[PDB]
Amino acid sequence: CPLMVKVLDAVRGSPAINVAVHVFRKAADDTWEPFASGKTSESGELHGLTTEEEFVEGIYKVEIDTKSYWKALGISPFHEHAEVVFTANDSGPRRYTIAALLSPYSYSTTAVVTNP
Amino acid sequence: KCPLMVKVLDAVRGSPAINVAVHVFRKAADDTWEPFASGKTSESGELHGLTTEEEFVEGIYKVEIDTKSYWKALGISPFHEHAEVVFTANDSGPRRYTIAALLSPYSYSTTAVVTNP
Amino acid sequence: KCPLMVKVLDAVRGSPAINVAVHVFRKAADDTWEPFASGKTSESGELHGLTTEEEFVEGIYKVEIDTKSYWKALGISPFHEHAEVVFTANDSGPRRYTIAALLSPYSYSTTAVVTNP
Amino acid sequence: KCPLMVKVLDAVRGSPAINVAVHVFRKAADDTWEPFASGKTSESGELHGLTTEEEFVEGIYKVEIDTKSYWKALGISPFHEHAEVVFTANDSGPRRYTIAALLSPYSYSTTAVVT
Ligand SMILES: O=C(O)c1ccccc1Nc1cc(Cl)c(OOO)c(Cl)c1
Numbered sequence: 001c002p003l004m005v006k007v008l009d010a011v012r013g014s015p016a017i018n019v020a021v022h023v024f025r026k027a028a029d030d031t032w033e034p035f036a037s038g039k040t041s042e043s044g045e046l047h048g049l050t051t052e053e054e055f056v057e058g059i060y061k062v063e064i065d066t067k068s069y070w071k072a073l074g075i076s077p078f079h080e081h082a083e084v085v086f087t088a089n090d091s092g093p094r095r096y097t098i099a100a101l102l103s104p105y106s107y108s109t110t111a112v113v114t115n116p
Numbered sequence: 117k118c119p120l121m122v123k124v125l126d127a128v129r130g131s132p133a134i135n136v137a138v139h140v141f142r143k144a145a146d147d148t149w150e151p152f153a154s155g156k157t158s159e160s161g162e163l164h165g166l167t168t169e170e171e172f173v174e175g176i177y178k179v180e181i182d183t184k185s186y187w188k189a190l191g192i193s194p195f196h197e198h199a200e201v202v203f204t205a206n207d208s209g210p211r212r213y214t215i216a217a218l219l220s221p222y223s224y225s226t227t228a229v230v231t232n233p
Numbered sequence: 234k235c236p237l238m239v240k241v242l243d244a245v246r247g248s249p250a251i252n253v254a255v256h257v258f259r260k261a262a263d264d265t266w267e268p269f270a271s272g273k274t275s276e277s278g279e280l281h282g283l284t285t286e287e288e289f290v291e292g293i294y295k296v297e298i299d300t301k302s303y304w305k306a307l308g309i310s311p312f313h314e315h316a317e318v319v320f321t322a323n324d325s326g327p328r329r330y331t332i333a334a335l336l337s338p339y340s341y342s343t344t345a346v347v348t349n350p
Numbered sequence: 351k352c353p354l355m356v357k358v359l360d361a362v363r364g365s366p367a368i369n370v371a372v373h374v375f376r377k378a379a380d381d382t383w384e385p386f387a388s389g390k391t392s393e394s395g396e397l398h399g400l401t402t403e404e405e406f407v408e409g410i411y412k413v414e415i416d417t418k419s420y421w422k423a424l425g426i427s428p429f430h431e432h433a434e435v436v437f438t439a440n441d442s443g444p445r446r447y448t449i450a451a452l453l454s455p456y457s458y459s460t461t462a463v464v465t
Binding site: 059067078079084087101106 | 410429430431432434435436437438452454456457458459460461462463464
């Protein structure tokens with residue numbers, strides 16, 4: 001479970017499905033190289049994006065297409081997209097789960113690490 | 117699927133709560149919160165299968181989590197004595213409920229989800 | 234400028250919550266929640282005028298925030314029956330306490346701001 | 351009393367965060383971020399002066415609260431590099447924006463209000 005970046009809808013009381021997500025890597029030129037993207041069908045979870053060999057001991061970024069989400073449900077969010085920036089794998093391979101409790105005009109997140 | 121479960125995880129250690137005592141009750145017209153079930157937070161910080169289809173009924177419930185015991189063992193002196201999640205259930209039939217519990221020494225937050233038939 | 238300030242915010246409309254029922258209790262010697270204070274949240278979203286250091290004493294307290302009146306009168310269908318915040322108070326030094334509540338129809342958050350005046 | 355306001359609350363100490371560096375950008379026509387305003391946080395955990403209604407105009411803006419240096423000063427090991435809030439401003443008209451951010455060593459949350 002490298003990045004099981006779960007996203008939850010705090011209004012519909014269901015996982016946020018069909019929400020586009022984008023990943024980036026730390027480029028040496030202070031740029032964000034695109035890495036992966038996708039949309040879900042029924043459940044709002046992220047997986048199968050980065051493999052054990054795809055990681056680096058560096059900075060990352062996760063972008064979630066949030067404004068496009070609510071227009072479909074006819075909601076007009078204040079936020080445009082959400083970004084979490086972190087340093088990973090400093091002490092070796094660990095499994096990272098990124099929380100994301102969305103809401104129109106509000107969001108929250110949390111990080112879960114492992115010992116080995 | 118699991119009829120309902122409680123999800124709890126520490127926002128300081130970045131790990132699910134381990135050995136955080138939990139309890140459940142039932143609403144009684146005499147205001148007496150008659151105890152119904154209890155449990156201990158495992159290494160995964162989750163308790164599931166507490167209320168079966170027969171055990172659970174359409175009514176008012178409460179979930180109590182022994183937050184203060186969780187911190188003092190870690191040598192941490194928290195603010196909240198415990199937490200409570202008061203709600204209604206099965207308004208129009210049986211459903212699946214999973215609730216969140218983001219513990220921090222001086223704060224917490226909860227969130228619940230419902231899945232349509 | 235009170236030792237007990239409760240702020241309630243709407244995480245859908247993005248406005249300070251208004252017309253929200255608030256109740257304050259206190260555990261008695263018989264483990265009884267003797268009523269302490271109550272009120273309704275204004276359009277500023279800050280509840281105040283609930284207690285003073287003359288009336289505020291050491292002990293275990295409880296804070297009640299109604300939710301059904303907030304959304305059902307608004308037309309939204311909530312999940313949580315209400316919000317209950319229970320905490321020790323004035324253990325040593327009557328520090329001013331601020332209680333924060335970020336409300337969503339299916340989720341809420343609580344945080345405490347403590348400071349010695 | 352400003353159209354833009356940001357406040358950061360520390361959960362572990364339960365006190366308003368102090369000395370939290372902040373920066374504000376603007377959506378440049380070259381898809382860049384021209385720096386707009388920056389600063390740190392006081393003992394009240396709020397922002398004292400960010401943007402007047404004169405400088406505040408339409409467009410997309412980004413605000414970042416520096417947290418990595420925070421917990422190192424606190425002596426705790428963080429996780430997040432920092433927190434990024436990006437939003438569309440003045441899409442329909444003037445308003446007053448307040449940004450609230452609850453910070454914990456391994457988690458954070460945020461929300462906004464309008465006027
Ligand atoms: O009010 C919030 O949005 C909030 C969100 C998460 C955690 C705590 C919160 N409470 C809170 C936040 C702020 Cl910024 C605040 O005042 O700012 O001038 C108050 Cl009174 C209460």
